Amino acid sequence: AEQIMRDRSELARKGIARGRSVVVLTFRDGVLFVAENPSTALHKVSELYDRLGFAAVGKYNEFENLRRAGIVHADMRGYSYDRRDVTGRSLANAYAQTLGTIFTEQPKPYEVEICVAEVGRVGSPKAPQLYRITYDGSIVDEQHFVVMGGTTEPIATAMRESYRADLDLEAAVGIAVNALRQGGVDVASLEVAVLDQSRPRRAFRRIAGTALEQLVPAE
Amino acid sequence: AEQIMRDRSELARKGIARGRSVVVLTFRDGVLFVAENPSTALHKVSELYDRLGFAAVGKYNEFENLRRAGIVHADMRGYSYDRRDVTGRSLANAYAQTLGTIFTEQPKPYEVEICVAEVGRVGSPKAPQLYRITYDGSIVDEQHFVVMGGTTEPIATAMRESYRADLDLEAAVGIAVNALRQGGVDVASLEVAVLDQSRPRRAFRRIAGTALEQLVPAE
Amino acid sequence: AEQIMRDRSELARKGIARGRSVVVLTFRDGVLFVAENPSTALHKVSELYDRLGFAAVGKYNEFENLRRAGIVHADMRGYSYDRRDVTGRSLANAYAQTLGTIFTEQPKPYEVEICVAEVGRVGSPKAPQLYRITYDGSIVDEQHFVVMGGTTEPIATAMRESYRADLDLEAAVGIAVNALRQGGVDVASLEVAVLDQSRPRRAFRRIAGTALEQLVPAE
Amino acid sequence: AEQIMRDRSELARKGIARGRSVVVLTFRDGVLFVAENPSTALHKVSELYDRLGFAAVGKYNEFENLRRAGIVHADMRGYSYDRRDVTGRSLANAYAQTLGTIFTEQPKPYEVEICVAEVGRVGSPKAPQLYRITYDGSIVDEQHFVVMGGTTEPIATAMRESYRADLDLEAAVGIAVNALRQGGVDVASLEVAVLDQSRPRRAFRRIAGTALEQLVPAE
Amino acid sequence: NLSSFTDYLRGHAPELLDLAPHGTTIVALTYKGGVLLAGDRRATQGNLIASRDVEKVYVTDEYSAAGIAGTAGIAIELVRLFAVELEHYEKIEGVPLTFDGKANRLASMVRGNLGAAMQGLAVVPLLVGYDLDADDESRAGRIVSYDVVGGRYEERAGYHAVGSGSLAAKSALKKIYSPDSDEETALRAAIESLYDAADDDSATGGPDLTRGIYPTAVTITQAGAVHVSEETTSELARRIVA
Amino acid sequence: NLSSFTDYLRGHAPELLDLAPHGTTIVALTYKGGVLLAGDRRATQGNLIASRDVEKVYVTDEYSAAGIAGTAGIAIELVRLFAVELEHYEKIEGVPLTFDGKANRLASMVRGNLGAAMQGLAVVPLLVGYDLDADDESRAGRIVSYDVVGGRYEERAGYHAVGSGSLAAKSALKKIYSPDSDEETALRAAIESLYDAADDDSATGGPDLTRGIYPTAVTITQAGAVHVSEETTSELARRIVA
Amino acid sequence: NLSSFTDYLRGHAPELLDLAPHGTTIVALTYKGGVLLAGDRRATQGNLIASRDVEKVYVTDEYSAAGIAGTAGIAIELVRLFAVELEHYEKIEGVPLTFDGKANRLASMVRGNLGAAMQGLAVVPLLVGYDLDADDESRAGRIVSYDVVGGRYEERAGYHAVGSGSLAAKSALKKIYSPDSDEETALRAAIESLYDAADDDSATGGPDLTRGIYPTAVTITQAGAVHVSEETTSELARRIVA
Amino acid sequence: NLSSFTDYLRGHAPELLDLAPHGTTIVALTYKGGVLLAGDRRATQGNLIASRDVEKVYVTDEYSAAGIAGTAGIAIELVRLFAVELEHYEKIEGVPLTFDGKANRLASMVRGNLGAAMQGLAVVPLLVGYDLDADDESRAGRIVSYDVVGGRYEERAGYHAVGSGSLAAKSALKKIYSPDSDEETALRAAIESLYDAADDDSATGGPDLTRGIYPTAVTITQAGAVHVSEETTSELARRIVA
């Protein structure tokens, strides 16, 4: 009684584990989101802001909230100051703080794992940045790639040994879609999108169907 | 039941323990901050005020809060009265009371350890002061050096027998960086900053990369 | 289940016990404050008002609060009415009611023992008065001397057989500093102050270092 | 579980019992307050109003409150209507209700036993009335004498067989002071006061020291 | 909860903090013994006399008293409360308030009426008392005057007054009054200026031998404050007349 | 809870934040030692004089003090509070406030009366002090003036004044004053302009040799602040006359 | 909780959001290096001069500053707060605000005073800074002007001004100012129009050689903002004269 | 929590819902492709010109934009907020709002300002857009006008305008305009009426060839909205002239 945190903790871990997985990566255009998503309608990755992307895993409703919440917290800053000041680090901490609280206070912790990605402005030589936040309020500054959901071990290493900078898009899709197969099957029945540093404003587009074909490698 | 304090306390102690460490010291220029920070984006040491520095350890979100909270509490006094009146003692006590309360009332105590540092104004012969506040609201007035996080015992004594006043900067970095290695590995992959009593206002700058090289001693 | 008071109580008693000690006494000039305080920055004795002094023991943050709370409850009455109406008995009762309530309702009782001292106005033939309030809201009107902190038994009796009225200041310093040694080592590394009935207003001054030498007896 | 009242109940009884005692009586002048009080500053009997007295037992801070609370509840009525409408019955009930609720809801019951006494106006042939309220909201209309605190049994009967109407004051002091000694030692180190029906307004004076001598019988 | 009866109302019963029956003149004198208050008794709402036996000076407590000038209604409730405030603070703290306390409290109660004040219904008191804490028990008497915005002021001239005929009375005293004097001489000078105030002010109208209307008085000293008898005044006002 | 006594009331007792007895003139001079304040003592409600012995300058703390001009009632409570704000900040923080702090505080309290200000009842203070943190303890004396909307302003000319006769006194000093001087010379130029202020202003009326009404003064130096003696003033104003 | 020092007060201490000492003119010029601010130093309440040494331009942060015209009391506190808002946002976010952020913030603080504005006590700022985020670091200096209802406006003409003599100065610059120029040339044209503003406006009154009253200035560039020396100004105004 | 950025402010930060720099004229035209806006750029506070380069038309989102006339300050913040109100609803709902949605929202935002409206500080917008949900993509362009009390009105006549010179422009178009036409013909007719509005209205003042001041424009179509270039306007207004 006190190490209830041990318990709660497990509850989330287990809930996250027993579910589909996601991989986010750093490449040439900017940042790629590839996550198993059978759903035709409900997403798992979303534009968070001008140069900000978001993708989670766990119970939908729970990260759905955290998603809207972000969308709001961003908009707020942008309006309050200047879109130019909305950052990733900002929505990172924010999520950290929120989840951290939820964990400690809410009746049931949030079975969620979140990834916030920001792809540099529309010019400067700054390399994308990745952020992962755990159900209990933990963040880590990943500069290469990030994986969450289901069983990470296989997919994780399958990448540790499979990652390359300046990775072409078509190729970064492979690297990931492969590792993904290495832990669980891999039809063009998922949702992918990307934060394109080329774009001048939006910077976030989703790779539809007809054009995803020509990216994902077969068995 | 009543000596839950015992429990809760352990909860903190342990969580702090099972995590990277930090060292703060008094020297020639003013005050040096050396802490193991692999993170490229999320800091562990921060300008708290004009002549004030801050550095903590434990769960990030938790001490991150306490960091912002300080920043604010400082600014407030500075605005309310005069920057000239913001002291380290003030922020010490503050934190003390805050954590003290959290420990007593929050559902889960804060796995945090904090160090507040003030390096005299821009001239007078006053020697820097250091403060340490524990997860349960305990402070101590360290005039020399302070260490927190991970396993202190080794790094602790590794300094009790390694500390010198008027200690050059380059050398102070050694003194510290060394003691750190004597407990756990030591690449120029951490964050280091200093409260330079030479500065007229800010007094807190961070020692970037290209310049850290020529300060940290190899194996 | 009900005699939790038993428990809670012990919690405090123990916390108080396992810590340094203090002695307050009645003499010629007015009232003397001698308490073991290694700290160079954080005091344990404070000017509560015009003719009022305050000293405590237990967890810092906790009595620190109660110190400030007093400082305020005093000023209030002084402003609301007249400095001439701020008494020792007022703050005494105050503290009593407060502590008695914490004890009863706070999640953790206050590990504190407090002493309120008033040295008569700047003229009349009234002898100082002393007040001690315990972690559970208990007060006693001590006219001679008062001891709190750590192990009282030794130092207590070491005074019962060692107290003298109109006691000179230099000697009163001995009387106490001695009995303190008889239970725990005694360097000019403590904090001492006094409530000087000579003074017209303030009445509370602290005996610095250079002048304490010539007051504390050696081994 | 439900007969917590049994418990709480015992908590008070025991706390009250383990403490000095008080005796209140009806006599010639009006009403006498004799209670064991070694304290030189903190009383246990107070003028509650024009024709009202109050005396209690238990933890200090706890009845002290209820004391102040009466003083006010009285003043209130006297201002709201007319001092002539402030009765003993009012305050009695009031207290009954208060403690009654405390007992039932507060975290810990009030270790208190209280006595409200009213000595008829300044003329009419009305005989004083006495009120006793227990830590659990119980009142009784005592017309003769009332005892409380410590071990009542000895002092109690020591009065049942020792009481006399129209009793002289000097003699009423004996009657009580005696019975007090019969259970627990009896120096002029207590506090005595009386509600004098002779007086036109106040009706409450405390017998100081120089004059108590000649009233209390020796061993 | 700071021993202020008032402040209790503040948080527990707030509803207690010439259209209607006016004021009158009141005088204050210092002297060897202690001090005293004397004030007219004519309440006038307009140019019409509403009452000729209204007491304007009350005994606040054992060693002090004050007279209030302004709207009768507002001035009464205010002093009654001031009295209570003082008594309660004693029964609670055990001791009584400094004189300087009683005054600062009265001020607060005045500062509180400032709203009604700026709306015509203004009141202003004159406080007097034997300072049990004064070094020289010779000049232990004191006189405190007030503002409407609640300022507290020290007499420091032996006398003062408030009300319509105050300018008059103050002037009469400027002549008919001298320092350290009898508690008979002063009570005399008082009934005097209170006569002069009545001369140059239809709103006052001091001693009226024909009707039996005599000035109300109160003296305070090292023994306390006592309200002078109707005899000590009338056979005193007859003496003043010529 | 920020060591502000005021702010405590702000949240625990908010009820503490020519119809009534006006102001007067107050001067301020800088010098070798420190700085000082000298102010008139005539309170005037209307064209009528209300008191000729009122003190307008108070010692706020060990190393500072101030004088306030405007509604006496408001001005008093305001400085009394200022004093406390300071003392309380000390006892809590252990140390005292910067001079620049004491000032910023005083200004907040003034801004706080802006409401009453726009309703006639305005007040404005003059703050002086020995800046224990000034580099050159030679020019360690300071003078801060105020707005009504609560602006803080630095003297930077060795002298200032506030009140009806300020315009006059300022002008006198613009002549009879010189930098680094004695704590006898400045106290001299102060009683002087305080005299010229009274010449061209019926609301002031400085030194009156016939009545015994002398200007109140206070000097602050590296030793702290002390209120000049009634003697050092009279035998000083007699010197000024011709 | 959005890194807004302001917004913290908004929710935790709301009490911080010609009767009193007026304004003056302030000029803003753009140039090769960066930008600058130069403004008069005369505070005038009425037709009366209240102070001739009041600084009207402040350096808000490392790479920006602003001058505020309007009621001095309100304009001071407002900029000091803007300063803090900027600094606090940094220490929290680690990085500083865009320039476009600093302005949007400043505008909100102005919109905040709109209440007081519609009551006479209005204040309007002029903001400048070196946009560290500007593409062509040539024209990286910027000028933002404001409304009273809080509108934010871009200069886009290399110069601007606010205050009584603004119409004057703006017109002088319309002649004496040319694009890309020295940080000596612009500082020259500034002291110039600031002279012309004083010619046709008693409320201003620029460079006064006889008294030693010289315009306050500040330049901001890729190195940051620095307050121009009293020497670089006087030996600069002397040059302008004829 | 209804996907309304605004409504989020409503409950979590309410503080975001000729004394100051006025308005100008803005025109709207319908055509084959889609629709467009063109507005003057002269801001006038009084009879004085305050700015001649202020943009009055903004692109709200991918397929719509609007020009607002009235208090510049109130009108700026209002459109920006509208923009965000739109973008946020998309990010949240994933799709964008109907055009009839965007309008009803904009109407709500106007209705909100009615308070300030009835105090002079009013503002009124003109909303245009390519209705991606219109049946006949031939007449897919739309124009919505507004009240002050927040009414929403449909054009249904190919053109409209708002501002001081609107009555003028509206009339010019009542002549120089014809249905289904080039996005070159309509951009032509707009610059025209925008010329006539300036003829009979000193507040407007359209295309000024001598200064380089050219009307701002924006055209929305099935491709979305894009801001016409400064070239396509000047070489376009030169054609208009005679």
Curated annotation (Swiss-Prot), chains A, B, C, D:
What are its GO cellular component terms?
A: cytoplasm; proteasome core complex, alpha-subunit complex
Gene3D superfamilies with a match to the protein in the record: Glutamine Phosphoribosylpyrophosphate, subunit 1, domain 1
UniProt protein name: Proteasome subunit alpha 1
Q: Does the keyword Cytoplasm apply?
A: yes
**Gene name as annotated:** prcA1
Question: PTM details?
Answer: The N-terminus is blocked.
As one GO molecular function, the record gives: threonine-type endopeptidase activity
Record's subunit section: The 20S proteasome core is composed of 14 alpha and 14 beta subunits that assemble into four stacked heptameric rings, resulting in a barrel-shaped structure. The two inner rings, each composed of seven catalytic beta subunits, are sandwiched by two outer rings, each composed of seven alpha subunits. All four combinations of alpha- and beta-subunits (beta2-alpha1, beta2-alpha2, beta1-alpha2 and beta1-alpha1) yield fully assembled and proteolytically active proteasomes. The catalytic chamber with the active sites is on the inside of the barrel.
Per the record, the pathway is: Protein degradation; proteasomal Pup-dependent pathway
Q: What regulates this protein's activity?
A: The formation of the proteasomal ATPase ARC-20S proteasome complex, likely via the docking of the C-termini of ARC into the intersubunit pockets in the alpha-rings, may trigger opening of the gate for substrate entry. Interconversion between the open-gate and close-gate conformations leads to a dynamic regulation of the 20S proteasome proteolysis activity.
Described by its record, this protein's role is as follows: Component of the proteasome core, a large protease complex with broad specificity involved in protein degradation. The R.erythropolis proteasomes are able to cleave oligopeptides after Tyr, Phe and Leu, very poorly after Arg but not after Glu. Thus, displays chymotrypsin-like activity, low trypsin-like activity but no caspase-like activity.
From Swiss-Prot, chains E, F, G, H:
Which keywords are on file for this protein? Answer: Autocatalytic cleavage, Cytoplasm, Hydrolase, Protease, Proteasome, Threonine protease, Zymogen
SUPFAM superfamilies reported in the protein's UniProt record: N-terminal nucleophile aminohydrolases (Ntn hydrolases)
* Biological pathway: Protein degradation; proteasomal Pup-dependent pathway
Q: Which InterPro entries match?
A: Ntn_hydrolases_N, Proteasome_sua/b, Proteasome_suB-type, PSB_actinobac
Q: Which GO terms describe its cellular component?
A: cytoplasm; proteasome core complex, beta-subunit complex
Main location class: cytoplasm
Q: List the disulfide bonds.
A: none
GO MF annotation terms: endopeptidase activity; threonine-type endopeptidase activity
Q: How is its activity regulated?
A: The formation of the proteasomal ATPase ARC-20S proteasome complex, likely via the docking of the C-termini of ARC into the intersubunit pockets in the alpha-rings, may trigger opening of the gate for substrate entry. Interconversion between the open-gate and close-gate conformations leads to a dynamic regulation of the 20S proteasome proteolysis activity.
Superkingdom classification of source: Bacteria
User: Per the UniProt record, which EC number(s) apply here?
Assistant: 3.4.25.1
Where found in the cell? Cytoplasm
Q: Which family does it belong to?
A: Belongs to the peptidase T1B family.
Give the PANTHER family listed for this entry.
ATP-DEPENDENT PROTEASE SUBUNIT HSLV, METALLOPROTEASE TLDD
Q: What's the record's remark on domains? A: In contrast to M.tuberculosis, the propeptide is required for correct proteasome folding and assembly. The propeptide is positioned strategically at the region where it can act as an assembly-promoting factor by linking its own beta-subunit to two adjacent alpha-subunits at the same time.
Which purpose does this protein serve, as stated in its record?
Component of the proteasome core, a large protease complex with broad specificity involved in protein degradation. The R.erythropolis proteasomes are able to cleave oligopeptides after Tyr, Phe and Leu, very poorly after Arg but not after Glu. Thus, displays chymotrypsin-like activity, low trypsin-like activity but no caspase-like activity.
- Official protein name in the record: Proteasome subunit beta 1
Which organism encodes this protein? Rhodococcus erythropolis (Arthrobacter picolinophilus)
Question: What phylogenetic lineage does the species belong to?
Answer: Bacteria, Bacillati, Actinomycetota, Actinomycetes, Mycobacteriales
